[PDB]
Ligand binder design. Structure first.
Ligand SMILES: [Mg+2]
Ligand SMILES: [Mg+2]
Ligand SMILES: [Mg+2]
Ligand SMILES: [Mg+2]
Ligand SMILES: [Mg+2]
Ligand SMILES: [Mg+2]
Ligand SMILES: [Mg+2]
Ligand SMILES: [Mg+2]
Ligand SMILES: [Mg+2]
Ligand SMILES: [Mg+2]
Ligand SMILES: [Mg+2]
Ligand SMILES: [Mg+2]
Ligand SMILES: [Mg+2]
Ligand SMILES: [Mg+2]
Ligand SMILES: [Mg+2]
Ligand SMILES: [Mg+2]
Ligand SMILES: [Mg+2]
Ligand SMILES: [Mg+2]
Ligand SMILES: [Mg+2]
Ligand SMILES: [Mg+2]
Ligand SMILES: [Mg+2]
Ligand SMILES: [Mg+2]
Ligand SMILES: [Mg+2]
Ligand SMILES: [Mg+2]
Ligand SMILES: [Mg+2]
Ligand SMILES: [Mg+2]
Ligand SMILES: [Mg+2]
Ligand SMILES: [Mg+2]
Ligand SMILES: [Mg+2]
Ligand SMILES: [Mg+2]
Ligand SMILES: [Mg+2]
Ligand SMILES: [Mg+2]
Ligand SMILES: [Mg+2]
Ligand SMILES: [Mg+2]
Ligand SMILES: [Mg+2]
Ligand SMILES: [Mg+2]
Ligand SMILES: [Mg+2]
Ligand SMILES: [Mg+2]
Ligand SMILES: [Mg+2]
Ligand SMILES: [Mg+2]
Ligand SMILES: [Mg+2]
Ligand SMILES: [Mg+2]
Ligand SMILES: [Mg+2]
Ligand SMILES: [Mg+2]
Ligand SMILES: [Mg+2]
Ligand SMILES: [Mg+2]
Ligand SMILES: [Mg+2]
Ligand SMILES: [Mg+2]
Ligand SMILES: [Mg+2]
Ligand SMILES: [Mg+2]
Ligand SMILES: [Mg+2]
Ligand SMILES: [Mg+2]
Ligand SMILES: [Mg+2]
Ligand SMILES: [Mg+2]
Ligand SMILES: [Mg+2]
Ligand SMILES: [Mg+2]
Ligand SMILES: [Mg+2]
Ligand SMILES: [Mg+2]
Ligand SMILES: [Mg+2]
Ligand SMILES: [Mg+2]
Ligand SMILES: [Mg+2]
Ligand SMILES: [Mg+2]
Ligand SMILES: [Mg+2]
Ligand SMILES: [Mg+2]
Ligand SMILES: [Mg+2]
Ligand SMILES: [Mg+2]
Ligand SMILES: [Mg+2]
Ligand SMILES: [Mg+2]
Ligand SMILES: [Mg+2]
Ligand SMILES: [Mg+2]
Ligand SMILES: [Mg+2]
Ligand SMILES: [Mg+2]
Ligand SMILES: [Mg+2]
Ligand SMILES: [Mg+2]
Ligand SMILES: [Mg+2]
Ligand SMILES: [Mg+2]
Ligand SMILES: [Mg+2]
Ligand SMILES: [Mg+2]
Ligand SMILES: [Mg+2]
Ligand SMILES: [Mg+2]
Ligand SMILES: [Mg+2]
Ligand SMILES: [Mg+2]
Ligand SMILES: [Mg+2]
Ligand SMILES: [Mg+2]
Ligand SMILES: [Mg+2]
Ligand SMILES: [Mg+2]
Ligand SMILES: [Mg+2]
Ligand SMILES: [Mg+2]
Ligand SMILES: [Mg+2]
Ligand SMILES: [Mg+2]
Ligand SMILES: [Mg+2]
Ligand SMILES: [Mg+2]
Ligand SMILES: [Mg+2]
Ligand SMILES: [Mg+2]
Ligand SMILES: [Mg+2]
Ligand SMILES: [Mg+2]
Ligand SMILES: [Mg+2]
Ligand SMILES: [Mg+2]
Ligand SMILES: [Mg+2]
Ligand SMILES: [Mg+2]
Ligand SMILES: [Mg+2]
Ligand SMILES: [Mg+2]
Ligand SMILES: [Mg+2]
Ligand SMILES: [Mg+2]
Lengths: 119, 123, 56
RNA sequence: AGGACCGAACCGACUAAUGUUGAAAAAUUAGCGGAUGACUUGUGGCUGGGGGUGAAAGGCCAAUCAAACCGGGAGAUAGCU
RNA sequence: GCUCGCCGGAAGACCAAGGGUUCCUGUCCAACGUUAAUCGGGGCAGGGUGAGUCGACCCCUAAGGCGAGGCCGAAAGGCG
RNA sequence: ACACAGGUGGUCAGGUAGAGAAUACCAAGGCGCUUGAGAGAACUCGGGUGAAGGAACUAGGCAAAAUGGUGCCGUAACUUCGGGAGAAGGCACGCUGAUAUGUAGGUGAGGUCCCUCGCGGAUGGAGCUGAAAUCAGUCGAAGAUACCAGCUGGCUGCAACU
RNA sequence: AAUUCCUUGUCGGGUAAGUUCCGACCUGCACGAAUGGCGUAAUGAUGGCCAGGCUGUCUCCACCCGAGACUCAGUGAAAU
RNA sequence: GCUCAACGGAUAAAAGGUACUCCGGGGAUAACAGGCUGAUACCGCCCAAGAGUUCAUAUCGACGGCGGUGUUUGGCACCUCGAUGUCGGCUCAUCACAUCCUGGGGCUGAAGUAGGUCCCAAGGGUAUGGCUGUUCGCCAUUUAAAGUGGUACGCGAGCUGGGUUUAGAACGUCGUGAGACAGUUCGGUCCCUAUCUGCCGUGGGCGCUGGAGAACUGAGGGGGGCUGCUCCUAGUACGAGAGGACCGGAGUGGACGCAUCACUGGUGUUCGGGUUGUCAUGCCAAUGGCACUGCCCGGUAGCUAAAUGCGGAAGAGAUAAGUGCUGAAAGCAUCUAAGCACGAAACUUGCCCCGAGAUGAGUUCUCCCUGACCCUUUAAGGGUCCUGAAGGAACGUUGAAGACGACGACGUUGAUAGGCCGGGUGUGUAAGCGCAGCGAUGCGUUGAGCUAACCGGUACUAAUGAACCGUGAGGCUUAACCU
């Protein structure tokens, strides 16, 4: 039973989930809006939004942490140079889920997850 | 937390080094025996010239467990091994004359006042 | 692990009694573009609760 | 030197689990035996059914063997269903 | 296209055997593909295999097959 | 019979570690296995860890768990004198420095000499490569740290053995 | 005893307790000398037994990781 | 002229094996189980010769007699041979009472303690090992006790496959032999995705007579019911002593059950760290990937037991066996016929849970709706327009609720979830820099850094304005009241 637990398994093992959210968090920082499934979009908030909160304090150590989470220097540069000062006053809630219907191949409930200050 | 087939060390100078519990007394289907509990045992290893002999069948009182015993504050006292003091079958008084290693306050009673008297340390 | 008599088409219809689909109750209407969409979903043109949430 | 030793390829198939309308008309997974020899393998050949072949289990002889397969006698015969 | 993961004495590369156009390009999505398919070893049309030295053929023989005469066997045929 | 976890002979053989064509991770190269998406019940499948006990389970330690490397020390009954035997049992093992700015060893250039003269013979040691050991130090709970990789002994039936 | 019916023979060992095992006894139902007798080092994916280590084998199960089972979408069997 | 003697004589002339097997058939016919029966078996009873110092009947009971049960060994061959899988174990059981324990009694050759025996009683309880395939049995040690049976010798579309009972092989034995042996020995494929009944759970529909939200009553059903030991009474009663109670009270256990996570722990592949090999991030440094989570070390929440709380009752009613009181029939006697009293873990209650589909569909409380007209076949009729309530449902955020439904929380007038902030907890002194050291490294900055599910906060993000379903005063018949 699943009393008081957290984190979605998403029919993957633990290393695949960590590598999928490492790719997907970098893809959300890169394009500022992506289209994924609704369970993966809700679980992505627990990855990207700690990275943006990490990016508010530009130290050398925090660059190394954000690189250890994402492993892409282009994402770490965009986190601390752009998304750091863009969200510097917001107390969390850096992103937005927009449910966009159903995928044609498998009836998966999709959603757009985007950053708040995009448009 | 002693059951059948459990080997125990021997805590007195009765002459045994290694005994095995064969029955936990005092109740049908009784699984375990903590400290202060009487167990029927057999002897698996002895000194060459002791009061007891290899293969004797007799009783014993458990005085130290590796599982440990709990105190009413919630604390627990664990030991590194399992130790028992041999008893007579009938009179159920200890056979050896000198108890080795510590014992606990759960052991003391009207039944085992002699063993805590001879123990070097009573926790 | 297998039947001994042929179940009737009456029993077949009674098993399918619960297999009916539920149509969508009411489509919500956007306040700006005026088009219909699922409640709490974005529209086909990219509106949601008035604002244009995504270009096309 | 070795029908020597340990151990991959390769050859085999001891045990368990799975599988048993299977992924598979005998396999997979984890172990296992042999592994310079009475070894193993490619290609081609030869032996034919009361016959072959057999380090012999009545084993094998095209998913078939106490007498293969196909066609014929043939609509064998059936005091049996 | 960028990441991620997997094989790497193979899940890479070259052949023989075997298959026989599955090759390449255009086009099509009914059926076939255990789903969708714009994709395909699917349909349709076109294109593609260039040798004095590679291989075969050829020269040579092994096991073995066939076997002039011959010998043997009712016939068929058997052996050489 | 299938776009089938099977079967199928030859050739090619990169790096790091390693005795190695084992095995781990990679290169060249090639793939993600032609249904997905959720959920995170029982139960089944394949695994991980477990208090205390440690074969009480069971037809039976079946299955699991454990052992596992190298060097050195050491090793019984019995015996066909080969064995048994890796018997059993134990110790050492990383990294850094020093010995020695890289040693022993390997390789072997210039230089010089000789020569029936060359793809020659000495000498010569530059340069390259490079174990192993001792001593000192230092880190961790743990130094054969992963993968990999013997459980061992006693009695006995049968069959010599492969 | 791979042979022994009676039989779990008796005695001894091992075990707290041993129809198995090991050593004896001989009363061999119904061993026996190349359908070989008795021994026997080494060898055995061989049979029985015992011990150490080891452990979810078990006392008595608990939790966790994945693949199914469950729900949705697509396709869509079978025995009877 | 035939012991053609199997004598109405198959030929002048004929034995075996098959577990290597095969075909046609049979429940016409065996093995398993059911059935019928009850000889046998088991359990009762009748008579009482005796035993019991005396004394048949405390306990036994010869010779014999009568039954019960269906329970063994059997009888029969009725079902099944176009298949009803079988010994033992395992895992679930369930019933009987001819009761093993605990409860209540009577008699005793019952001093007490402890027994014997019989009666009542089926509520609960009712070992673990050694050997053997074993059931059984013996043995070891327990326990209040280690009940006897039915259940296809319960249970293989739940498991096992040791035994039996295929093909291999061997011994002894039998046979000339092929082979055979309820003689032995080693080895030897256990299939099935559940349509119906059943059962465990969980929903949809409709009903309950206007609709809706709640709270209930309890018809009925289920759960539960075990017991040791010590102390006091009291070394009292009893007894020559040895010994040693009833009754009553208190404590502490075993087994079982329910709940829980505060403690002690387990797990904790989502947290932290160490470390091996290798690859990559240009390199150093620092990280990440892969190697079972690479291998370990710890560990949050959650779930958990081995952890710790709690439970079995007391009481009442009516009783069984039993014990009586008064009391006749029958001047006496007599527990019974009239009348009355006591009496057990059984029975009904008391405790816990489900529970109005309890169609006999109950009760209470609250809320909501107070429009017009047409119609002909005039009726519990049909339709139009207006109206859309209480509420519900859907959707969304979700949950210590959950397979799915369901259930619960929340939807801006908002802490439902995520984030964020702070705290806690865990891990154990990050990175960078500086210093010391030839260097590995050490030290300082520094209990640093990171920190999941936790705690307290916070609208930052997501929970939309709506629409949808549900209507518009609710039948007849009496009765009692109201004017
Ligand atoms: Mg939560
Ligand atoms: Mg899936
Ligand atoms: Mg991994
Ligand atoms: Mg039928
Ligand atoms: Mg249905
Ligand atoms: Mg060899
Ligand atoms: Mg073979
Ligand atoms: Mg294998
Ligand atoms: Mg080998
Ligand atoms: Mg045979
Ligand atoms: Mg064949
Ligand atoms: Mg033939
Ligand atoms: Mg024939
Ligand atoms: Mg004819
Ligand atoms: Mg015919
Ligand atoms: Mg074609
Ligand atoms: Mg092509
Ligand atoms: Mg094409
Ligand atoms: Mg189409
Ligand atoms: Mg298709
Ligand atoms: Mg084509
Ligand atoms: Mg050529
Ligand atoms: Mg020739
Ligand atoms: Mg000719
Ligand atoms: Mg010829
Ligand atoms: Mg495929
Ligand atoms: Mg290599
Ligand atoms: Mg490899
Ligand atoms: Mg596939
Ligand atoms: Mg799971
Ligand atoms: Mg494990
Ligand atoms: Mg354990
Ligand atoms: Mg631990
Ligand atoms: Mg432990
Ligand atoms: Mg045992
Ligand atoms: Mg047992
Ligand atoms: Mg094993
Ligand atoms: Mg293992
Ligand atoms: Mg023997
Ligand atoms: Mg042999
Ligand atoms: Mg014999
Ligand atoms: Mg015998
Ligand atoms: Mg044993
Ligand atoms: Mg004996
Ligand atoms: Mg045994
Ligand atoms: Mg003997
Ligand atoms: Mg013989
Ligand atoms: Mg002879
Ligand atoms: Mg012989
Ligand atoms: Mg479906
Ligand atoms: Mg006759
Ligand atoms: Mg006659
Ligand atoms: Mg037949
Ligand atoms: Mg019949
Ligand atoms: Mg019968
Ligand atoms: Mg009779
Ligand atoms: Mg008398
Ligand atoms: Mg009598
Ligand atoms: Mg009699
Ligand atoms: Mg019967
Ligand atoms: Mg009868
Ligand atoms: Mg019968
Ligand atoms: Mg008859
Ligand atoms: Mg029947
Ligand atoms: Mg039959
Ligand atoms: Mg039938
Ligand atoms: Mg009775
Ligand atoms: Mg009595
Ligand atoms: Mg009952
Ligand atoms: Mg009962
Ligand atoms: Mg009852
Ligand atoms: Mg009751
Ligand atoms: Mg027993
Ligand atoms: Mg019976
Ligand atoms: Mg049965
Ligand atoms: Mg029974
Ligand atoms: Mg059975
Ligand atoms: Mg068997
Ligand atoms: Mg045989
Ligand atoms: Mg037989
Ligand atoms: Mg309902
Ligand atoms: Mg009741
Ligand atoms: Mg009681
Ligand atoms: Mg807890
Ligand atoms: Mg807590
Ligand atoms: Mg802990
Ligand atoms: Mg752990
Ligand atoms: Mg915990
Ligand atoms: Mg690494
Ligand atoms: Mg580095
Ligand atoms: Mg990689
Ligand atoms: Mg790899
Ligand atoms: Mg009562
Ligand atoms: Mg009177
Ligand atoms: Mg009277
Ligand atoms: Mg009364
Ligand atoms: Mg507020
Ligand atoms: Mg929140
Ligand atoms: Mg914090
Ligand atoms: Mg702390
Ligand atoms: Mg620092
Ligand atoms: Mg670190
Ligand atoms: Mg800290
Ligand atoms: Mg909170």
């Amino acid at each position: 039973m699943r009393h008081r637990k957290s984190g979605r398994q998403l029919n993957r093992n633990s290393s695949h989930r960590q590598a999928m959210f490492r790719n997907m968090a970098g893809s959300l920082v890169r394009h500022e809006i992506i289209k994924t499934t609704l369970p993966k979009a809700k679980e992505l908030r627990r990855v990207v939004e700690p990275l943006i909160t990490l990016a508010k304090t530009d130290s050398v150590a925090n660059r190394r942490l954000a690189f250890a989470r994402t492993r892409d220097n282009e994402i770490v540069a965009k986190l601390f140079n752009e998304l750091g000062p863009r969200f510097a006053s917001r107390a969390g809630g850096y992103t937005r889920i927009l449910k966009c219907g159903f995928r044609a191949g498998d009836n998966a409930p999709m959603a757009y997850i985007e950053l708040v200050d995009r448009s | 937390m002693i059951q059948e087939q459990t080997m125990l060390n021997v805590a007195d100078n009765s002459g045994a080094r290694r005994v095995m519990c064969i029955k936990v007394l005092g109740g049908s289907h009784r699984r375990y025996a903590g400290v202060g509990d009487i167990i029927k045992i057999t002897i698996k290893e002895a000194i060459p010239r002791g009061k007891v002999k290899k293969g004797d069948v007799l009783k014993a009182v458990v005085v130290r467990t590796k599982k440990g015993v709990r105190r009413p504050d919630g604390s627990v006292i664990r030991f590194d091994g399992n130790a028992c003091v041999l008893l007579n079958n009938n009179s159920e008084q200890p056979i050896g004359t000198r108890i080795f290693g510590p014992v606990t306050r759960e052991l003391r009673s009207e039944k085992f006042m002699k063993i805590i008297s001879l123990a070097p340390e009573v926790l | 692990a297998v039947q001994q008599n042929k179940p009737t088409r009456s029993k077949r219809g009674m098993r399918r009694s619960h297999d009916a689909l539920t149509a969508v109750t009411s489509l919500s209407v956007d306040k700006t573009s005026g088009e219909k969409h699922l409640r709490h979903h974005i529209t086909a043109d990219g509106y949601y609760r008035g604002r244009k949430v995504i270009a096309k």
